[PDB]
Structure formats: structure tokens, C-alpha cells
Amino acid sequence: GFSSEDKGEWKLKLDNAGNGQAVIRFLPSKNDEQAPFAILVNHGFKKNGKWYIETCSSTHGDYDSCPVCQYISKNDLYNTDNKEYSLVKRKTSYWANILVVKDPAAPENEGKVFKYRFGKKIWDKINAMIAVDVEMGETPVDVTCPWEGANFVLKVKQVSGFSNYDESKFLNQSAIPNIDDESFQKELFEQMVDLSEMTSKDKFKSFEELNTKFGQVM
Ligand SMILES: [Zn+2]
Numbered sequence: 534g535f536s537s538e539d540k541g542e543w544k545l546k547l548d549n550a551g552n553g554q555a556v557i558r559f560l561p562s563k564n565d566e567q568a569p570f571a572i573l574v575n576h577g578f579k580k581n582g583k584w585y586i587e588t589c590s591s592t593h594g595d596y597d598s599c600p601v602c603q604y605i606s607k608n609d610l611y612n613t614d615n616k617e618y619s620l621v622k623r624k625t626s627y628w629a630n631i632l633v634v635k636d637p638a639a640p641e642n643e644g645k646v647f648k649y650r651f652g653k654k655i656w657d658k659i660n661a662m663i664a665v666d667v668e669m670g671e672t673p674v675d676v677t678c679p680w681e682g683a684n685f686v687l688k689v690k691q692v693s694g695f696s697n698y699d700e701s702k703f704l705n706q707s708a709i710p711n712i713d714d715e716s717f718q719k720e721l722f723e724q725m726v727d728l729s730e731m732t733s734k735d736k737f738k739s740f741e742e743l744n745t746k747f748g749q750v751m
Contacts, residue, residue: 542650548638553638554689556685557633573592580620585747590740592732632644633646682706686703688701
């Protein structure tokens with residue numbers, strides 16, 4: 534497998550030592566009000582040498598329409614079979630429209646906009662920006678605001694065979710340069726996808742489809 538950029542999906546290029554770094558900027562909601570971040574739940578496991586990788590409807594409260602959700606529920610796997618559990622458990626992913634400010638490993642990406650996926654560690658980092666400590670001179674930040682945001686420094690290094698994001702961190706506040714220019718603003722926005730698209734009926738609402746599939750995989 535390889536290159537994702539061409540399809541509008543950016544991924545941090547890691548080097549030989551599994552390390553990597555960049556400066557990206559999380560963009561606000563394309564559309565009115567809110568939701569600059571998409572939250573999608575799935576299940577992704579291999580068993581018997583087969584793979585089950587599908588979206589989950591728990592993503593909008595509907596746990597019943599998901600075979601794997603029912604399985605974990607009926608069998609209390611969390612408790613009765615914790616090994617099956619961690620394998621089978623639902624996975625949460627977050628997506629954003631981002632502006633690559635600096636990408637040393639691939640400079641042609643800078644200034645371009647892509648959709649970016651991530652997990653709890655970077656999500657937490659985004660949330661702790663609003664939950665600050667006043668006694669340390671901290672003030673809350675909407676890192677997605679084009680005028681009050683803060684670029685993010687994405688830094689990776691392998692620990693225990695796992696990418697560790699501990700060096701990642703938000704910089705001071707600032708405005709996206711040129712943001713107030715209509716040509717620029719509109720070219721940036723032309724590059725932003727509708728994140729709600731990812732959370733519409735992309736779920737095989739045919740739990741039955743999902744079930745025969747879960748079936749031959751199990
Ligand atoms: Zn599920």
C-alpha cells in the first residue's frame with residue numbers, strides 16, 4: 534500500500550526510524566454552525582485469517598443494527614472473553630480538513646488542504662486547549678478558528694512498536710495568513726470536503742449484509 538495524498542487524504546510520512554514531523558492547521562466547519570470534526574466508529578479485525586472491517590452504527594446511537602455490537606453485548610465479552618473483546622471492540626476515528634503549513638518530508642504538500650484522520654491522543658490535545666489552567670496564564674483556544682487558532686506541531690517517534698504522539702503540541706495563537714483575502718479564502722474552501730458526508734448512510738444499514746459478512750468472517 535502507499536500514497537494517499539492524491540485522493541485528498543494526507544498522512545504524516547515517517548522516516549526509517551518510524552519518526553516524523555510537520556506543522557498542520559485544523560480547519561473550521563465548511564458549513565454553518567458546527568462540526569469541524571467527523572467522528573466515525575468502526576470494527577476492524579482479522580480472525581481465521583479473514584478480515585472484518587466495517588463502519589458501526591453506534592456512531593449515531595444505533596448499536597442494534599451492528600452484528601459486532603450485538604455479539605459483544607449478548608456475550609458480555611468485555612467481561613467473559615476480554616481477549617475476543619479487544620480484538621472485536623469498536624474503534625473511533627476522527628477526521629478534519631487541514632492546511633499543511635510545513636511538511637519537510639514532502640514540501641509539495643505545504644499550503645495545500647487535505648482531510649486528515651486521527652485518534653484520542655490528538656483529539657485530547659485539541660480538547661485540552663479549551664480546558665485550561667487559569668493560574669498558569671492559560672486562556673482557552675478554538676484551534677480551528679481562522680483568526681484565533683493555533684497551528685499544531687505533529688511529531689511521531691516509535692515506542693514499543695507504537696507511534697507515540699507525546700511531542701505533538703499547539704503553538705501560540707495566530708491568524709492563517711492571507712485568510713482575509715477572498716481569492717485565497719475561497720481556494721482554501723474549495724479544497725475542504727463536507728465531513729458530514731462520512732457520517733451519513735455509509736453504514737451498511739442492511740445489518741443482514743453486515744451479518745452474513747460477520748458470519749463468514751467468524
Ligand atoms: Zn458495532
